[PDB]
């Protein structure tokens, strides 16, 4: 089974949308490569190679391939029948795999499978080249140039195409050579962890719970603490600083008490069991936030509450929640509780050892290393957590060739994947929350904003109460990230800042209010592109700010084209 790195270059017209150039390069032998100007020529090769092919960002390239397949006697089927293709396309419209089936010799399936290398390496090509220390050509292909059918590729364009497939070829090979061969970064991460722990032990510490338990365990899942102090809402403020936790999640995984094994179900209020020290409690009650304390509770699926705001009060109706003991302890400290009704719960065996070996291994490699290998170490540490915190829904989109020659997608069969071990998801995030909320509270008089692993504060001095836990590099510590001259927060995840910058050898880094030469303007706003951010200033950054320069994908006959769309701050 050979592996190839692949790329297309396409036209931008709605009416005339087609591949004008392709390239493939053997990942294991970079001297074997081909660059052509015909999709038909490439697809003929696709059907012969019986190989695994990778495109960087399949979502785009894949639309051109499916368009060809449907026009050349292929149909979509999940069964893997002769002359059919299969796909993995999520509810979110992320592409994972196109599996093109030709037939069978004996029982051995004759097929070519296409994967998205962006799930292996979640970065743009240039960003990869820069970080992995790989040769990257300056500039780009001129997209404002007319290329009729049969257009001959110039030697410079040829160079650029080759460079693209090669950067990905070089990065993927380095990865496969570490033995990281799974479809996604997270899978590689899980596989590496499993190797260390042992399948035998893994199955014992992380058993598969029934769908029913799993459903109740996930009622306790909350995510990340994201909160803006009402005091600062939509106001231009002065100097402040930002702190960031060094690897918030691996930090919890490394040292916190976490659950393992089969849970034990109990009725009523939990009583302390040292063999089962962690628990989730299904509670019911009213509450009022204490004075001088940060809001903690968010009620997800209820008739009364707003799912997004952290609640100051139960509002005169009764709150029904499932809480990890970590969350419950925190709630009790921040709220007066009233009429507490203890319904039932689950208790778990707990340890702190489960992740040390895996983190140590890759933390070592990270500091020991540089370049590509350093980047892959980071991926391994940062991709594992996600695997414990995913829902079981793996329902996909089924492509079809539309009435007018474009592509359509219909939801397929409902389908469920077994979860890895959801209680681990619950507790890693609760501990994460505790880390952030705790610090933010200790700085109540200066706290502006929280976002999962960062704290935004008034003033420029490090508060005494956290000086002992501030470090530039130590795992799980708070790092003094940046300092701003002024800022404005519209709401959660919507704000702008003027960051102090200092030049250190040509390059520009974060400076202090005394030691600085420049101001870096930074914009954070959901759905806003890098291009649009450059248009934002302090004066215009308001609800209603609108620009018609957001690319939207449009399926047309032949493939996908990007078109300009109006984006507005709601
Ligand atoms: Pb290019
Ligand atoms: Pb390029
Ligand atoms: Pb139950």
UniProtKB/Swiss-Prot annotation:
GO biological process terms on file: DNA replication; viral DNA genome replication
Site (Stabilization of the incoming nucleotide): residue numbering on this chain: 361, 374
Region annotation (TPR2) ranges: 393-415
Motif (YCDTD): 449-453
Effect upon mutating residue 221 to F: Favored polymerization (high pol/exo ratio). decrease in forward and reverse rates of translocation. Increased affinity for dNTP and for pyrophosphate in the pre-translocation state
Stated consequence of mutating residue 222 to K: No effect on the pol/exo ratio
Impact noted for substituting residue 246 to D: No effect on TP-DNA replication
Site (Probably involved in positioning the templating nucleotide at the polymerization active site and in controlling nucleotide insertion fidelity): 379
Consequence of changing residue 123 to Y: Almost complete loss of interaction with TP
Phenotypic consequence of residue 524 to A: Increased exonuclease activity and loss of primer elongation. Deficient in nucleotide incorporation
Entry cofactors: Mg(2+)
Impact upon substituting residue 57 to D/H: 88% loss of ssDNA-binding. Decreased in fidelity of DNA replication
Outcome when changing residue 118 to N: Loss of capacity to interact with a DNA primer/template structure
Mutagenesis or variant effect for residue 524 to E: Increased exonuclease activity and complete loss of primer elongation
Molecular function terms from GO: DNA binding; DNA-directed DNA polymerase activity; exonuclease activity; metal ion binding; nucleoside binding; nucleotide binding
Segments for region (Involved in DNA-binding, coordination between DNA synthesis and degradation and TP interaction): 187-224
Protein's job: Polymerase responsible for protein-primed viral DNA replication by strand displacement with high processivity and fidelity.
Misc. comment: This DNA polymerase requires a protein as a primer.
Recorded domain comment: The N-terminus contains the 3'-5' exonuclease activity and strand displacement ability. The conserved motif YxGG/A located between the 3'-5' exonuclease and polymerization domains is important for DNA-binding, coordination between DNA synthesis and degradation and for the formation of a stable complex between TP and the DNA polymerase. The C-terminus is involved in the protein-primed initiation, DNA polymerization and pyrophosphorolytic activities. The YCDTD motif is essential for the pyrophosphorolytic activity.
Protein name: DNA polymerase
The organism of origin for this protein: Bacillus phage phi29 (Bacteriophage phi-29)
């Amino acid at each position: 089974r050979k592996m190839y790195s692949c790329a297309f270059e396409t036209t931008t017209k709605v009416e005339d949308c087609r591949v004008w150039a392709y390239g493939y390069m053997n990942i294991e032998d970079h001297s074997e490569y081909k660059i052509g100007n015909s999709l038909d020529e490439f697809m003929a090769w696709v059907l012969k190679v019986q190989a695994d092919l990778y495109f960087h960002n399949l979502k785009f390239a894949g639309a051109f391939i499916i368009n060809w397949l449907e026009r050349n006697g292929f149909k979509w089927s999940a069964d893997g029948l002769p002359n059919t293709y299969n796909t993995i396309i999520s509810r979110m419209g992320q592409w994972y795999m196109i599996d093109i089936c030709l037939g069978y010799k004996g029982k051995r399936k004759i097929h070519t499978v296409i994967y998205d290398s962006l799930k292996k390496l979640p970065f743009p090509v240039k960003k990869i080249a820069k970080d992995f220390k790989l040769t990257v050509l300056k500039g780009d292909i001129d997209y404002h140039k007319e290329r009729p059918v049969g257009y001959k590729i110039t030697p410079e364009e040829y160079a650029y195409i080759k460079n693209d497939i090669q950067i990905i070829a070089e990065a993927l090979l380095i990865q496969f050579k570490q033995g990281l061969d799974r479809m996604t970064a997270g899978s590689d991460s899980l596989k590496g962890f499993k190797d260390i722990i042992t399948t035998k032990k893994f199955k014992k510490v992380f058993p598969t719970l029934s769908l029913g338990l799993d459903k109740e365990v996930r009622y306790a899942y909350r995510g990340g603490f994201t909160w803006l102090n009402d005091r600062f809402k939509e106001k231009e403020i002065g100097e402040g600083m930002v702190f960031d936790v060094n690897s918030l999640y691996p930090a919890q995984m490394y040292s916190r008490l976490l659950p393992y094994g089969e849970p034990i179900v109990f009725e009523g209020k939990y009583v302390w069991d040292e063999d089962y020290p962690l628990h989730i409690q299904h509670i019911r009650c009213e509450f009022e936030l204490k004075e001088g304390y940060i809001p903690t509770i968010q009620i997800k699926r209820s008739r009364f509450y707003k799912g997004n705001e952290y609640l100051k009060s139960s509002g005169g109706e009764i709150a029904d929640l499932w809480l990890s003991n970590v969350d419950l302890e925190l709630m009790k400290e921040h709220y007066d509780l009233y009429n507490v009704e203890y319904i039932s719960g689950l208790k778990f065996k707990a340890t702190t050892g489960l992740f040390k070996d895996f983190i140590d291994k890759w933390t070592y490699i990270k500091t020991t290393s540089e370049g590509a290998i350093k980047q892959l170490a980071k991926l391994m540490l940062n991709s594992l957590y996600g695997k414990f915190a995913s829902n079981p829904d793996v329902t996909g989109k089924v492509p079809y060739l539309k009435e007018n020659g474009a592509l359509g997608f219909r939801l397929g069969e409902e389908e469920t994947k077994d979860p890895v071990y959801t209680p681990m998801g619950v507790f890693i995030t609760a501990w994460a929350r505790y880390t952030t909320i705790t610090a933010a509270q200790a700085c109540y008089d200066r706290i502006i904003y929280c976002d999962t692993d960062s704290i935004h504060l008034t003033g420029t001095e490090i508060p005494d109460v956290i000086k002992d836990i501030v470090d530039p590099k130590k795992l799980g510590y708070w790092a003094h990230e940046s300092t701003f001259k002024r800022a404005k927060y519209l709401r959660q995840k919507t704000y702008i800042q003027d960051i102090y910058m200092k030049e250190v050898d040509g390059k520009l880094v974060e400076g202090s209010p005394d030691d600085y030469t420049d101001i870096k303007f930074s914009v954070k706003c959901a759905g806003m592109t890098d291009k649009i951010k450059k248009e934002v200033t302090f004066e215009n950054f308001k609800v209603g700010f609108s620009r018609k320069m957001k690319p939207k994908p449009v399926q047309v006959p032949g493939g996908v084209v990007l078109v300009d769309d109006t984006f507005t701050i709601k």
